[PDB]
Symmetry: D2
Subunit: 115 residues, 4 copies
Amino acid sequence: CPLMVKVLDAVRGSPAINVAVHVFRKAADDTWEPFASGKTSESGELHGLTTEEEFVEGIYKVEIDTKSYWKALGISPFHEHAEVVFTANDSGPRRYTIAALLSPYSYSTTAVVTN
Amino acid sequence: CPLMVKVLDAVRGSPAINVAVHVFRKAADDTWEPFASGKTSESGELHGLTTEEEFVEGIYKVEIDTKSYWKALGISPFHEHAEVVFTANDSGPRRYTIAALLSPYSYSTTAVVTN
Amino acid sequence: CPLMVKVLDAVRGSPAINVAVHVFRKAADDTWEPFASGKTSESGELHGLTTEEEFVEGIYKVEIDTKSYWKALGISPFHEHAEVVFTANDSGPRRYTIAALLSPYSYSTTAVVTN
Amino acid sequence: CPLMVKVLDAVRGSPAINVAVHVFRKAADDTWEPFASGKTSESGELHGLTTEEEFVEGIYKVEIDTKSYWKALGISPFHEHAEVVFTANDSGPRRYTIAALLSPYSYSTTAVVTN
Ligand SMILES: O=C(O)c1cc(Cl)c2oc3ccccc3c(=O)c2c1
Ligand SMILES: O=C(O)c1cc(Cl)c2oc3ccccc3c(=O)c2c1
Ligand SMILES: [Ca+2]
Ligand SMILES: [Ca+2]
Ligand SMILES: [Ca+2]
Ligand SMILES: [Ca+2]
């Protein structure tokens, strides 16, 4: 699988478990078409979103549903979601790990890209 | 003005100057409609985006054109842009500062909400 | 003043107020000697730590007492403190802002160096 | 091994390889005694620093030699090192992953603590 998502909780110092993640791909008409979705495991990782065949060149949006995560823990956070938008595979296939570090009023997102 | 945006450059250790910023408000049909925009100043700040009367409760998206910023510096970026999506909530008097700290393959964003 | 420290709270989305900050300069015997200190203001900022004449080239450590900050808010922290160690270098006129963004199990720090 | 260190490069979107890491433990006389050291692998991870028997309660300092890393890549960075100071094992043994995300003028550090 060439796209993995990892989410961490900076309040608890733990993986962020059961975080919903939706991936979209920009269509020819410039709309966001649904591409894949899943939820993080007990390790905070989401594997198996897509395949080498399906994950073609394009502009992708990874929406990490941070508000739903915080609300399930009884917390009212600031952001609706974390949104990571990037062009993928423009110079051939790559493997992408998208990591997000979450706090109620702040997040960071980082990409590790390997060949 | 109840909404300010501040952008910093983690590679050069400087304000991120002349970065385009677009603010959208979510419409009833779930589309994003333009709300305010500008370019960051020499201090990395964008003031005067909106007024108290215009900035009603709702869902807002702040899109920071990070790819064009890095390209103007000759540095290869990952993201198309940085997105910050949040709900404005009238809980007494409030001023929102949206800060973004930019690196080529990572960004962080924080909200500082003060009375 | 050539050195300012700014501290933000990523859990509450606020300046980090009344945080103790200690600055040390590395002495010839590799020990850290006290140089300046204070507490952050209601804006999360600590101004007036030093003067142009006092702030010579050398290695400095900024220690931010994050554990006491979180304890005063009733929140369980990981770190004893946040440390920022850097060399001051006379490359033309320079002002240093050391910013720290605090969460219970994570912090980030950035230097904004301006002319 | 109950202490692992992971380092990422936010400029390249890659593991930070060959980063030196020194761990110290506060001694009874309040000095930092050397505890363990190593270097990150091609994955950006440093395993095998210590053992369950050796990693007793205490206050530990993890120094990540970021300046040497950037200088080996031909870059002049701001910080001397990243310094992570924490009390370990106070409520019994835990496993600690310390992650650092590096840019030339900024870094973040996060702890994931598991039982
Ligand atoms: O007001 C400033 O001068 C200033 C300077 C720095 Cl380095 C800053 O770094 C930051 C790093 C992460 C998140 C927010 C900030 C800031 O809001 C910030 C503000
Ligand atoms: O693989 C891990 O166990 C692990 C642990 C921690 Cl704390 C991590 O913190 C991070 C903080 C910012 C950006 C990325 C990461 C990570 O990718 C990360 C990975
Ligand atoms: Ca292509
Ligand atoms: Ca309301
Ligand atoms: Ca010099
Ligand atoms: Ca104990």
